Protein backbone atom coordinates (compact mmCIF):
# COMPACT_ATOMS: atom_id res chain seq x y z
CA UNK A 1 0.00 0.00 0.00
CA UNK A 2 1.05 3.61 -0.67
CA UNK A 3 -2.04 5.66 -1.38
CA UNK A 4 -4.87 6.28 1.10
CA UNK A 5 -7.08 4.15 -1.07
CA UNK A 6 -4.75 1.24 -0.83
CA UNK A 7 -5.01 1.35 2.94
CA UNK A 8 -8.77 1.75 2.79
CA UNK A 9 -8.87 -1.32 0.54
CA UNK A 10 -6.87 -3.29 3.10
CA UNK A 11 -9.18 -2.16 5.84
CA UNK A 12 -12.26 -2.95 3.74
CA UNK A 13 -10.89 -6.48 3.46
CA UNK A 14 -10.25 -6.67 7.18
CA UNK A 15 -13.87 -5.64 7.69
CA UNK A 16 -15.21 -8.00 5.02
CA UNK A 17 -13.33 -10.87 6.67
CA UNK A 18 -13.38 -9.70 10.30
CA UNK A 19 -9.68 -9.36 11.02
CA UNK A 20 -9.65 -6.67 13.80
CA UNK A 21 -6.27 -7.91 15.04
CA UNK A 22 -4.91 -7.52 11.56
CA UNK A 23 -6.38 -4.07 11.01
CA UNK A 24 -5.08 -3.10 14.46
CA UNK A 25 -1.63 -4.22 13.40
CA UNK A 26 -1.69 -2.48 10.00
CA UNK A 27 -2.75 0.73 11.67
CA UNK A 28 -0.06 0.26 14.30
CA UNK A 29 2.38 0.22 11.39
CA UNK A 30 0.88 3.49 10.09
CA UNK A 31 1.24 5.28 13.42
CA UNK A 32 4.93 4.43 13.34
CA UNK A 33 3.47 16.11 15.62
CA UNK A 34 0.98 16.06 12.75
CA UNK A 35 1.14 12.27 12.51
CA UNK A 36 0.46 11.98 16.25
CA UNK A 37 -2.48 14.35 15.88
CA UNK A 38 -3.83 12.19 13.06
CA UNK A 39 -3.51 9.04 15.21
CA UNK A 40 -5.45 10.54 18.13
CA UNK A 41 -2.33 1.39 22.46
CA UNK A 42 -3.62 2.58 25.83
CA UNK A 43 -0.14 3.62 26.95
CA UNK A 44 0.33 5.57 23.71
CA UNK A 45 -2.99 7.35 24.18
CA UNK A 46 -1.94 8.24 27.73
CA UNK A 47 1.36 9.65 26.48
CA UNK A 48 -0.50 11.70 23.86
CA UNK A 49 -2.75 13.03 26.62
CA UNK A 50 0.24 14.03 28.74
CA UNK A 51 1.83 15.80 25.78
CA UNK A 52 -1.39 17.72 25.09
CA UNK A 53 -1.55 18.77 28.74
CA UNK A 54 2.05 19.97 28.61
CA UNK A 55 1.31 21.99 25.48
CA UNK A 56 -1.75 23.55 27.11
CA UNK A 57 0.28 24.47 30.19
CA UNK A 58 2.87 26.03 27.91
CA UNK A 59 0.18 28.08 26.14
CA UNK A 60 -4.92 25.30 16.06
CA UNK A 61 -7.60 23.93 13.72
CA UNK A 62 -7.39 20.46 15.25
CA UNK A 63 -7.90 21.98 18.73
CA UNK A 64 -11.03 23.80 17.53
CA UNK A 65 -12.38 20.60 15.96
CA UNK A 66 -11.83 18.80 19.26
CA UNK A 67 -13.72 21.48 21.21
CA UNK A 68 -13.26 21.25 5.07
CA UNK A 69 -14.00 21.90 8.75
CA UNK A 70 -17.43 20.25 8.63
CA UNK A 71 -15.94 17.11 7.08
CA UNK A 72 -13.37 16.97 9.90
CA UNK A 73 -16.09 17.38 12.53
CA UNK A 74 -17.99 14.53 10.87
CA UNK A 75 -14.92 12.27 10.89
CA UNK A 76 -14.26 12.99 14.56
CA UNK A 77 -17.85 12.12 15.37
CA UNK A 78 -10.96 9.47 23.53
CA UNK A 79 -10.39 10.49 27.17
CA UNK A 80 -7.14 12.19 26.14
CA UNK A 81 -9.08 14.03 23.46
CA UNK A 82 -11.77 15.15 25.91
CA UNK A 83 -9.09 16.43 28.31
CA UNK A 84 -7.36 18.40 25.57
CA UNK A 85 -10.74 19.87 24.58
CA UNK A 86 -11.32 20.92 28.19
CA UNK A 87 -7.89 22.51 28.42
CA UNK A 88 -8.62 24.46 25.20
CA UNK A 89 -11.96 25.66 26.58
CA UNK A 90 -10.21 26.78 29.77
CA UNK A 91 -7.60 28.73 27.80
CA UNK A 92 -10.37 30.34 25.74
CA UNK A 93 -12.20 31.36 28.89
CA UNK A 94 -8.92 32.79 30.21
CA UNK A 95 -8.41 34.83 27.05
CA UNK A 96 -11.98 36.16 27.30
CA UNK A 97 -14.05 37.29 36.89
CA UNK A 98 -16.65 34.52 37.16
CA UNK A 99 -15.42 33.01 33.91
CA UNK A 100 -11.88 32.99 35.31
CA UNK A 101 -13.12 31.26 38.46
CA UNK A 102 -14.95 28.63 36.41
CA UNK A 103 -11.76 28.01 34.42
CA UNK A 104 -9.70 27.68 37.60
CA UNK A 105 -12.25 25.21 38.96
CA UNK A 106 -12.07 23.18 35.74
CA UNK A 107 -8.27 23.15 36.05
CA UNK A 108 -8.41 21.93 39.66
CA UNK A 109 -10.84 19.19 38.62
CA UNK A 110 -8.51 18.10 35.84
CA UNK A 111 -5.55 18.00 38.29
CA UNK A 112 -7.58 15.83 40.65
CA UNK A 113 -8.40 13.42 37.80
CA UNK A 114 -4.68 13.10 36.83
CA UNK A 115 3.12 16.51 38.86
CA UNK A 116 3.91 18.93 36.05
CA UNK A 117 0.21 19.64 35.60
CA UNK A 118 -0.12 20.43 39.31
CA UNK A 119 2.84 22.82 39.11
CA UNK A 120 1.35 24.61 36.09
CA UNK A 121 -1.91 24.96 38.02
CA UNK A 122 -0.11 26.41 41.05
CA UNK A 123 1.67 28.88 38.75
CA UNK A 124 -1.65 29.94 37.26
CA UNK A 125 -3.14 30.44 40.75
CA UNK A 126 -0.20 32.56 41.86
CA UNK A 127 -0.63 34.74 38.72
CA UNK A 128 -4.32 35.23 39.50
CA UNK A 129 -3.49 36.27 43.08
CA UNK A 130 -15.29 31.25 47.44
CA UNK A 131 -15.89 28.21 49.64
CA UNK A 132 -15.65 25.87 46.65
CA UNK A 133 -12.39 27.54 45.66
CA UNK A 134 -11.00 27.05 49.15
CA UNK A 135 -12.03 23.37 49.09
CA UNK A 136 -10.26 22.91 45.77
CA UNK A 137 -7.07 24.61 47.07
CA UNK A 138 -7.18 22.31 50.05
CA UNK A 139 -7.57 19.16 47.94
CA UNK A 140 -4.60 20.32 45.90
CA UNK A 141 -2.51 20.82 49.03
CA UNK A 142 -3.46 17.31 50.12
CA UNK A 143 -2.43 15.88 46.76
CA UNK A 144 0.91 17.70 46.92
CA UNK A 145 10.49 15.11 39.61
CA UNK A 146 13.45 16.65 37.76
CA UNK A 147 11.26 17.68 34.83
CA UNK A 148 8.84 19.31 37.27
CA UNK A 149 11.67 21.24 38.92
CA UNK A 150 12.89 22.38 35.49
CA UNK A 151 9.40 23.54 34.57
CA UNK A 152 9.20 25.43 37.87
CA UNK A 153 12.56 27.08 37.14
CA UNK A 154 11.38 28.08 33.66
CA UNK A 155 8.23 29.59 35.16
CA UNK A 156 10.20 31.59 37.75
CA UNK A 157 12.42 32.93 34.95
CA UNK A 158 11.20 26.52 47.03
CA UNK A 159 8.25 25.72 44.78
CA UNK A 160 6.39 23.92 47.57
CA UNK A 161 7.00 26.89 49.87
CA UNK A 162 5.65 29.34 47.28
CA UNK A 163 2.60 27.10 46.92
CA UNK A 164 2.01 27.07 50.68
CA UNK A 165 2.33 30.88 50.74
CA UNK A 166 -0.22 31.22 47.95
CA UNK A 167 -2.61 28.88 49.83
CA UNK A 168 -2.23 30.98 52.97
CA UNK A 169 -2.97 34.14 50.97
CA UNK A 170 -6.11 32.54 49.50
CA UNK A 171 -7.30 31.49 52.96
CA UNK A 172 -6.77 35.05 54.22
CA UNK A 173 -8.78 36.39 51.27
CA UNK A 174 -11.62 33.95 52.02
CA UNK A 175 -11.60 35.02 55.67
CA UNK A 176 -11.81 38.71 54.67
CA UNK A 177 -14.75 37.99 52.37
Amino acid sequence: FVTNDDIEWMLSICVEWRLPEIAKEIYTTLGNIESIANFSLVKSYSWLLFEASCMEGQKVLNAIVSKDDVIIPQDILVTNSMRQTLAPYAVLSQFYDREDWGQALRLLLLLIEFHYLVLLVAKFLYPIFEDSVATVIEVIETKWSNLYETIIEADKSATLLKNLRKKLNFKLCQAFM
Binding site: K67, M82, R83, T85, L86, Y89
Partner: peptide
Protein backbone atom coordinates in the same frame (compact mmCIF):
# COMPACT_ATOMS: atom_id res chain seq x y z
CA UNK B 1 -21.07 17.66 25.79
CA UNK B 2 -17.47 18.86 25.93
CA UNK B 3 -18.00 20.16 29.47
CA UNK B 4 -19.68 16.92 30.56
CA UNK B 5 -16.70 14.89 29.36
CA UNK B 6 -14.29 17.20 31.26
CA UNK B 7 -16.27 16.79 34.49
CA UNK B 8 -15.92 13.03 33.97
Amino acid sequence: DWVEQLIL
